[PDB]
Structure formats: structure tokens, C-alpha cells
């Protein structure tokens, strides 16, 4: 575990993370996809061997010795708000299990279902709170990656609020 487990946020490409493993915002079919998933495919293409996994689950595939945790959030275009919320909470609990199993001291994580899977809604608070519910009981250093300047400020404030 980390000596004093923390949460941090950075506004940059998760493909350039400085952590011991990465969470992919994956699709269920293990396809190259777009956004985070496409950046992860360009950086760690070997990790997409048999990465396909259902919605609400996480599957780890090694790229050399570097773990890529493929986490499949719901597409809120397809799910009801209620069922989507349940599957989004579940994807993050499966990430917490994988981070713990791997014995890493740090993990880079994006906000699941906040991009093309958002169903055109702002889900920053919804996705971040599910991330906290899952990861609070882990002792890894968590580093959240985002691209928007306003999102960085909002995630930073939400972290600082609990400290």
C-alpha cells in the first residue's frame, strides 16, 4: 500500500500517467474505441488480447508487466438512469477488487461514463462519488485524469472537501 493513501487529480492524457497501473474506460467488446480507450489502445495495444468483458465489470490484461484494468461503464444512451447508476457503481467496485488483487501502490483512473457514454449529461459528481465509494477502502494512491480545466477545479474541490 501507499504510506499515506491519497487522492489527486491531473489534467493530461492518462496514457502518460506516472502510476503503477491504469484503468481503461473500455467498451464491452475490447475494441480500440475512441477518447480514453483509443489513447490506451495506442499506448498498450497488447493489453487488448481477450479484454472483452460485460458492462459493470473490470478485466485486467498485462502489457509486459504493466497492468491495464479494462473497466466497462454503462452507456446512458442505452440504460435507464436507475440501471445505469447501478452498473456504474458496480464497474468501480470491480476496479477496487483488481487494484487490491494486483498489490499496486498507485493507480491512474478516468471518470467512467462521463464522455461518449454520458447520454449527453454532466455526470462528474455521479461518477466521482461512485469512484470514492469503491476506492475509499483501498490503500493505493489514486490519481484521477481529466482533460477539461473546469472539471479539474471541480474534482480538486471535491477531493479537498473530505480532507
Ligand X SMILES: CCOC(=O)c1c(C)n[nH]c1C
Q: Which residues make up the interface to Cl ion (CB under 5 A)? A: 12-13, 115, 117, 146-148, 151
Q: Which residues pair with 58 in a beta bridge?
A: 71
Cβ distance to Cl ion smaller for residue 75 or 105? 75
| Minimal CB distance residue for ligand X | 39
Min separation Cβ 3 and ligand X, Å = 27
Is 110 in contact with 26 (CB distance < 8 Å)? no
Q: Which residues make up the interface to ligand X (CB under 6 A)? A: 13-15, 35-36, 39, 110, 115, 145, 147
Q: Considering only CA atoms, give the Rg of the chain.
A: 14
Residue 10 phi/psi, 5-degree rounding, is -135, 145
117 is annotated as contributing to ligand binding? yes
107 is annotated as contributing to ligand binding? no
* Distances, alpha carbon 99 to alpha carbons 2, 33, 127, in Å: 12, 23, 18
117 binds, among Cl ion, ligand X, none (CB under 5 to 8 A by kind): Cl ion
- Quick one: cell of 28? 464491452
52 binds, among Cl ion, ligand X, none (CB under 5 to 8 A by kind): none
**Beta-sheet strand order (sheet of 7-11):** 7-11, 141-146, 106-110, 22-25, 66-71, 58-63
84 binds, among ligand X, Cl ion, none (CB under 5 to 8 A by kind): none
151 binds, among Cl ion, ligand X, none (CB under 5 to 8 A by kind): Cl ion
Cβ distance to ligand X smaller for residue 15 or 158? 15
| Minimal CB distance residue for Cl ion | 115
Residue 161 phi/psi, 5-degree rounding, is -55, -35
24 is annotated as contributing to ligand binding? no
Cβ distance to Cl ion smaller for residue 91 or 107? 91
Q: Give the DSSP per-residue string, 62-86.
A: EETTEEEEEE----TTTS-HHHHHH
User: Which residues are documented as binding site for ADP-D-ribose?
Assistant: 13, 27, 35, 115-117
User: Which residues are documented as binding site?
Assistant: 13, 27, 35, 115-117
Amino acid at each position: 500500500g501507499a504510506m499515506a493513501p491519497s487522492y489527486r487529480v491531473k489534467r493530461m492524457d492518462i496514457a502518460k500517467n506516472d502510476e503503477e497501473c491504469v484503468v481503461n474506460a473500455a467498451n464491452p467488446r475490447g475494441l480500440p474505441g475512441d477518447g480514453v480507450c483509443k489513447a490506451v489502445y495506442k499506448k498498450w495495444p497488447e493489453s487488448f488480447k481477450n479484454s472483452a468483458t460485460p458492462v459493470g465489470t473490470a478485466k485486467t490484461v498485462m502489457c509486459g508487466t504493466y497492468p491495464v484494468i479494462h473497466a466497462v461503464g454503462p452507456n446512458f444512451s442505452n440504460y435507464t438512469e436507475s440501471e445505469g447508476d447501478r452498473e456504474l457503481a458496480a464497474a468501480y467496485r470491480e476496479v477496487a477488487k483488481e487494484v487490491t488483487r494486483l498489490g499496486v501502490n498507485s493507480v491512474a483512473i478516468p471518470l467512467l461514463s462521463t464522455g461518449v457514454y454520458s447520454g449527453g449529461k454532466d455526470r462528474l459528481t455521479q461518477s466521482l462519488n461512485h469512484l470514492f465509494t469503491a476506492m475509499d477502502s483501498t490503500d493505493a494512491d489514486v490519481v484521477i485524469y481529466c482533460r477539461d480545466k473546469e472539471w479539474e477545479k471541480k474534482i480538486s474541490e471535491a477531493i479537498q472537501m473530505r480532507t
